[model samples]
Every structure is written in structure tokens, then in C-alpha cells.
Target: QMFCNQTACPADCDPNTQASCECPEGYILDDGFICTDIDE
Candidate 1:
């Protein structure tokens, strides 16, 4: 069975792309890899 990662996300965010992986409302992508709430 394939384990869906985003299935645990509260927003049902998809990690397929930098855009699809909706990093919550106040969060954004850091280094294009991880999501962070810090202002860049």
C-alpha cells in the first residue's frame, strides 16, 4: 500500500510541487525544500 504523506496535513496540502504543497496561510517555502513561517 502506498502511504500518502499529505494525508496528514491539516490543509490537505500536496507536496508534489512548491506551489501545490500549500504551506498553511502564514508559511512559505524555505530553500525550495521545507516550509517555514519566517519572513524572508
Candidate 2:
């Protein structure tokens, strides 16, 4: 299960509390839910 819903990411994620999910090194969280590529 994920650590986020319609607000933010897990507090334990560290430095990444704005995303509902975690993304790869080259990716980022979009709309506080989806993980989109940085190059896209």
C-alpha cells in the first residue's frame, strides 16, 4: 500500500512529502499522485 492519498506523501519519505507516491531518480510526482517523467 502507498503512504499517500489526496494530500501528500508519507512523512517518513524524507524530502518528498508533496507526492502521494515515490518516483524513480529521473522521475517526479505530478498532481500529487501520478509519477511522471522529468523529460516528458
Candidate 3:
């Protein structure tokens, strides 16, 4: 995994990126992988 910006690149990127891979939200990195929910 990587500090994917969710655009301009895939989860598959160079390790050159840091402090942006591990998800910052709760649950786990796979969390921020998808945001925005319905029924607000």
C-alpha cells in the first residue's frame, strides 16, 4: 500500500512517498480508502 492520493496514480506507487501511506482515520488504512457516506 501507499499514501495514495486516490488519483493520478494507483495504490501501486513508489515508496518514495511517506507519511501519506498509512491511513489517518479510525479503523485502519483501508478506512480512508473510501470516504463519504449516504443518509446524512
Candidate 4:
């Protein structure tokens, strides 16, 4: 499910909502490598 979208990792995830894949609150995607609490 992680690489399903294949839109270049976390970039594929929407910060406002979750669709194909998603990251938890206070965290945004960073190439799917890691989750950071700070805003992007």
C-alpha cells in the first residue's frame, strides 16, 4: 500500500486528507522515508 500510487512517495499523499495512502496527524510525507511533525 505504501508505493501503490507511485507518485514519488509522500508527495502522492494529500496534506488535507487521505486517499490512496496517508500519514498521521502532525506529520507530512517526505519521500515516504520518514514522518516529520513540523510543517512542510
TM-score of each: 0.32, 0.30, 0.21, 0.23
Determine the C-alpha RMSD for candidate 2 after optimal superposition of all C-alphas: 7.2
Question: lDDT, candidate 2, residue 34?
Answer: 59
Report the poorest 10 consecutive residues by lDDT, candidate 4: 1-10
- Give one digit per residue, the lDDT tens place, for model 2 in 1-40: 3434433443245454543355545355665445543344
Tell me the whole-model lDDT of each prediction, alpha carbons only: 0.41, 0.46, 0.36, 0.43
Name the top TM-score candidate.
1
Clashing residue pairs in candidate 2, if any?
Answer: none
Regarding TM-score, does 2 or 4 come out ahead?
A: 2
Candidate 3 lDDT at 28 equals 33
lDDT of 4 by residue, 1-40 (tens): 2332433334345655444345444235564454333445
Clashes of 4: 0
| lDDT tens digits by residue: candidate 3, 5-34 | 544222332467543434334313333333
Candidate 1 local lDDT, 1-40, one digit each (tens): 1221343222324454334346546454455545443455
Best by lDDT: 2
Q: Per-prediction count of colliding residue pairs?
A: 0, 0, 2, 0
C-alpha displacement of 14 in model 1, angstroms?
5.2
Q: Which 10 successive residues of model 1 have the least lDDT summed?
A: 1-10
Sort all candidates by TM-score, best to worst. Answer: 1, 2, 4, 3
